[PDB]
Structure formats: C-alpha cells, structure tokens
Amino acid sequence: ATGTGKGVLGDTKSFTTTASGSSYQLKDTTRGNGVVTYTASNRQSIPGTILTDADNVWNDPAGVDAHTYAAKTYDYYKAKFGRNSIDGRGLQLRSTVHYGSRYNNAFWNGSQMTYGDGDGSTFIAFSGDPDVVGHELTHGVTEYTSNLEYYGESGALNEAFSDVIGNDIQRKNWLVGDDIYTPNIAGDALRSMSNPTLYDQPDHYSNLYTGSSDNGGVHTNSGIINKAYYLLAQGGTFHGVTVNGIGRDAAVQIYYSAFTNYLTSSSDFSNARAAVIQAAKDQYGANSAEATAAAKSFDAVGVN
Ligand SMILES: CC(C)C[C@H](NP(=O)(O)O[C@@H]1O[C@@H](C)[C@H](O)[C@@H](O)[C@H]1O)C(=O)N[C@@H](Cc1c[nH]c2ccccc12)C(=O)O
Ligand SMILES: [Ca+2]
Ligand SMILES: [Ca+2]
Ligand SMILES: [Ca+2]
Ligand code: NA
Ligand SMILES: [Zn+2]
C-alpha cells in the first residue's frame, strides 16, 4: 500500500505499508525480507508492536522517519554498493521507535535498530536524521563484514565507518546528527567530520584519547578517522600535509571496500591506513592520484 505522513522535521513523505484487514501496518514487504517498524510504547521491550494506522496517513513522526530512512538506506546500499540489506542476503530491517522515556540514545543491538525519543532538550527523536538511521544500520553491515570489536581503536573505526556512510547517504554537509541535536540552537551538531575538535573529538592521532570511558573512547577517537575521510574526499592541508581531494563518490567506494573487505575484528588505525590504501589501489591503480591521496590523508592525521 502507499502510506504517507510527516517526519520528525514536519516534512511529508511517502513509503510502503501493508493493508491488514481494516487498517495498515508499517511494514514494507518489497525490500529484501522486509522493512518493518515498531513502537516500544515508551517502555524498553523490543521489538515492541508493529505500528498501525487506520487510514494509511500516519501521525508518528519518529516511526515515519525510522521506516522511510530504513527503506532509503536499503536502496542506497543496493544502488551504491550492490549489497542486499545488512547481511548481503536481504535480512529483514527492523526498527523500533519510542524506546523508553525521554531516552537520549539510539543503537544497533545485533538484530535491529532502536531509537529513543530524546529528552526534547539535547535531542529530539533520533530517527529524524537520515545520517543517524544510516549510522545505526551501518553497525549491522559492520557486524556482518569486518566485525570490528567495540573497544579502543577498533571500536573507533566501527563508529567512524557508521559516520562516513550515514553522512554520505544524505550528503547535506559534513555533520552527523545535526537534524536531531539541540533543537534550540541552529547550525550545531553531534559531530563534525570536517572539523571534529568543534565537538571535543580529536582530529589528529597525537591527541588520541587513551582513557577508559566509552569503551576506550570509541565515540571520541572516531574523529581521527572522520577527519581522514573528509581530507580524502574534500582535500586540504592539515599538519603540513596536503591531500588532493578525490570527491565523495570515489572516497566512499574506497572506504566501503576497505572496511568491508580488508579490515578484521581486531584492526587498529594502522590497519585501516593499509586497507584504505589497498582499496584505493584496487579501484584506481597502485600509483594513481587516488592511492596517493589515500596515503596522504593518513599521513595528515598522524596515522602512520
Ligand atoms: C548517531 C548518534 C545519534 C547515536 C550513536 N549511537 P551508537 O554509536 O549507535 O550506539 C551507542 O554506542 C555503541 C558503541 C554501543 O554499542 C551502543 O549500545 C550505544 O551505546 C552515537 O554516536 N552515540 C554516542 C553519542 C551520544 C548519543 N547520546 C548521547 C547522550 C550524551 C552523550 C553522548 C551521546 C554515544 O552513545 O556516546
Ligand atoms: Ca491515520
Ligand atoms: Ca544530518
Ligand atoms: Ca541544534
Ligand atoms: Na545482540
Ligand atoms: Zn555508533
């Protein structure tokens, strides 16, 4: 069926649903084994119950965005990388919205994506930025490919890859989480890829977080890798090293290959340098502009 309704930002959009007797479920059976979207009804059981509406015009901004952006992320992965869902084999894409009460996170749990509402102050509903939905679904792709451990450098690569892909889906700017962060302040963001230190993440390896919080700083140290990606895609001069940019289209293909074909669950930043250089070489040639740019980008952020 064709359902319609507003996302978290108030924008009307359509999406596929299923008619069940007298009403409609937020379930699209036309993409792999499905895209299906649930409410946890402000408690913490997941998946919860499948969202329903009587007339197929939806009034649940969180669910409309979680569903629509899962479907858009499905299509982006098949169009851009030839991958069929998270496992490459059409794994059903399940999302739960209204997890808990004023809950300020979102997460991938090894099976589905889950989205809090936010407290209304720091965050609004998390499904409202396509680059957050991207970020969550990409943790799933990671699990099925490199299977990067969730601690120290490995866990930071895990997060940077989710930021790279989430951001690349929307391509609005170099920000992560900007649609859902601090509703009362325009222009800010949860993270910046172009300028990570703006949001207290390091952008150079000499400033690596070495404490034990946050699984050894997996959401902090990802800023190094995000900076490397940005320098490869955009170009720039940083710590004296000039990187000639190669554009997002080329950079994301190199990253996608590096993180899904070359990295393993124990990879550290140094292995990521090598995977990125290797993918650059596969795709463009050992001595190409792109393979040189892949090297400089890691030089510039101090990952040797
Ligand atoms: C895309 C972003 C909107 C959500 C994103 N959640 P994500 O990284 O998928 O998931 C989180 O981290 C993983 C490593 C754990 O496995 C998960 O259980 C979850 O804790 C994140 O960057 N979370 C950060 C930032 C953050 C979110 N809410 C916050 C509230 C306060 C401080 C920081 C935060 C974090 O948990 O740190
Ligand atoms: Ca309705
Ligand atoms: Ca965004
Ligand atoms: Ca804001
Ligand atoms: Na799990
Ligand atoms: Zn994450």
Numbering used by the authors: 1 to 304
Question: How do the authors describe this structure?
Answer:
The TLP Gentlyase, the neutral metalloprotease from Paenibacillus polymyxa (EC 3.4.24.28), is an extracellular metalloprotease that cleaves fibronectin, collagen IV and, to a lesser extent, collagen and has maximum activity at neutral pH. This enzyme is used to gently disperse mammalian cells and tissues and is widely applied in cell-culture procedures or for the isolation and tissue dissociation of primary cells. The Gentlyase metalloprotease structure shows the overall architecture of a typical TLP. The C-terminal and N-terminal domains are connected by a central α-helix containing several catalytically crucial residues.
Here, we report (i) a method that can be generally applied to identify suitable conditions to keep active TLP stable for crystallization and (ii) the structure of Gentlyase, the TLP of P. polymyxa, at 1.59 Å resolution in the absence of and at 1.76 Å resolution in the presence of phosphoramidon, the natural TLP inhibitor from Streptomyces tanashiensis. The only significant difference from the thermolysin phosphoramidon binding is observed in the rhamnose group of the inhibitor. The same phosphoramidon conformation is also observed in both independent copies in the Gentlyase crystal. However, the observed rhamnose conformation is also influenced by crystallization, because the rhamnose groups of both phosphoramidons in the crystallo­graphic asymmetric unit are involved in different crystal lattice contacts. In one instance the phosphoramidon hydroxy group O4 hydrogen bonds to Tyr151 and in the second instance hydroxy group O3 hydrogen bonds to Asn221 of a different crystal lattice neighbour. Because no domain movement was observed upon inhibitor binding, as for thermolysin and for aureolysin, the domain movement upon inhibitor binding observed in B. cereus TLP could not be confirmed as a general feature of TLPs. To prevent autolysis, the phosphoramidon-inhibited protease complex was first prepared in both a calcium-depleted and a calcium-containing form and both were then analyzed in a thermal unfolding assay. The calcium-depleted inhibited metalloprotease showed a significantly reduced apparent melting temperature of 337 K compared with 347 K for the calcium-containing enzyme in 100 mM CaCl2. Comparison with other TLPs showed that the marked calcium dependency of Gentlyase stability may arise from a partly degenerated calcium site Ca1–2 and a deletion near site Ca3.
